[PDB]
Amino acid sequence: MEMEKEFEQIDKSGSWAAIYQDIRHEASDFPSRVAKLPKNKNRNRYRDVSPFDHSRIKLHQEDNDYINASLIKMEEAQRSYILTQGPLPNTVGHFWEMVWEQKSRGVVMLNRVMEKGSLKCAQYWPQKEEKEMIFEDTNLKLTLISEDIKSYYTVRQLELENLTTQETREILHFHYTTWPDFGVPESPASFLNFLFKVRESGSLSPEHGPVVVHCSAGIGRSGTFCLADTCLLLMDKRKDPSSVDIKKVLLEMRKFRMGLIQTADQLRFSYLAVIEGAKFIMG
Ligand SMILES: Oc1ccccc1CN1CCOCC1
Numbered sequence: 001m002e003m004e005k006e007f008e009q010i011d012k013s014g015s016w017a018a019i020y021q022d023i024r025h026e027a028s029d030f031p032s033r034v035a036k037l038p039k040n041k042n043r044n045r046y047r048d049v050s051p052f053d054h055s056r057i058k059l060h061q062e063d064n065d066y067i068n069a070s071l072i073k074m075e076e077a078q079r080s081y082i083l084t085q086g087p088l089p090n091t092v093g094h095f096w097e098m099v100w101e102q103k104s105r106g107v108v109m110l111n112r113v114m115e116k117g118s119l120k121c122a123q124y125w126p127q128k129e130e131k132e133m134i135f136e137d138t139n140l141k142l143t144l145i146s147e148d149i150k151s152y153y154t155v156r157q158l159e160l161e162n163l164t165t166q167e168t169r170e171i172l173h174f175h176y177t178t179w180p181d182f183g184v185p186e187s188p189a190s191f192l193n194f195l196f197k198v199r200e201s202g203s204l205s206p207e208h209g210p211v212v213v214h215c216s217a218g219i220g221r222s223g224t225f226c227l228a229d230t231c232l233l234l235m236d237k238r239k240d241p242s243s244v245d246i247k248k249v250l251l252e253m254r255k256f257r258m259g260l261i262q263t264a265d266q267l268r269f270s271y272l273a274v275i276e277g278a279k280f281i282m283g
Pocket residue numbers: 146148155156157172197200201202
């Protein structure tokens with residue numbers, strides 16, 4: 001069923017809460033035993049947001065391989081994403097170890113460091129060229145190379161050095177800075193423009209490891225970003241773009257990480273974003 005007429009229909013009947021609860025009831029439940037081990041309590045931001053065992057990213061070390069991060073592998077679309085929490089003071093070294101080990105070219109950040117007067121993630125990248133960061137626990141160095149500040153997003157070029165081998169790589173930091181403290185954006189236009197900038201960078205392409213995507217918990221805004229990207233690619237792959245079922249794609253992604261899309265308003269915004277992104281690509 002075409003999504004745009006459908007959208008107006010779901011609006012007219014005011015049933016977003018009921019649709020969202022149907023998704024919550026049908027979502028996968030898989031074990032997260034590693035996340036819940038007592039030795040990992042200070043590696044989780046939120047007690048109710050954990051990676052499944054089957055899809056968790058493992059750190060390459062014998063001591064403790066745990067990070068709150070999941071591999072979302074979309075078979076038909078041929079896209080993969082790592083979705084992770086905003087890094088904590090004691091996991092900033094693990095975060096950059098993961099980017100290094102997974103061969104990622106891009107990090108996508110959808111939150112501010114402070115929102116609602118509280119800290120939503122650590123200041124995990126350097127703010128000045130001449131003040132680099134060293135992560136002694138994982139033996140990495142990170143340098144700010146350049147910063148481009150725009151009205152709706154900032155893009156940074158970073159240099160990550162593995163101090164063990166003296167190898168270096170160029171990481172692109174895509175920072176969406178305008179998501180409102182409460183609710184969702186009124187228009188999806190700036191979010192869709194941002195998605196198009198990440199795509200045009202090569203960060204989502206199969207010659208690199210998966211993009212790393214985060215917000216504060218790594219399920220709400222982060223879920224909206226991957227859901228919109230996969231749905232729009234499927235529309236360009238299929239003979240019938242109207243066959244793409246956003247609720248079925250979201251339930252496929254929920255096989256790999258719990259809780260993706262945290263509210264009925266985020267569900268509406270995703271449908272909104274896919275509907276408006278379809279129109280712009282059309283011709
Ligand atoms: O290298 C890219 C290619 C396509 C898109 C984006 C980038 C990253 N740029 C951000 C700041 O300007 C120089 C690098």
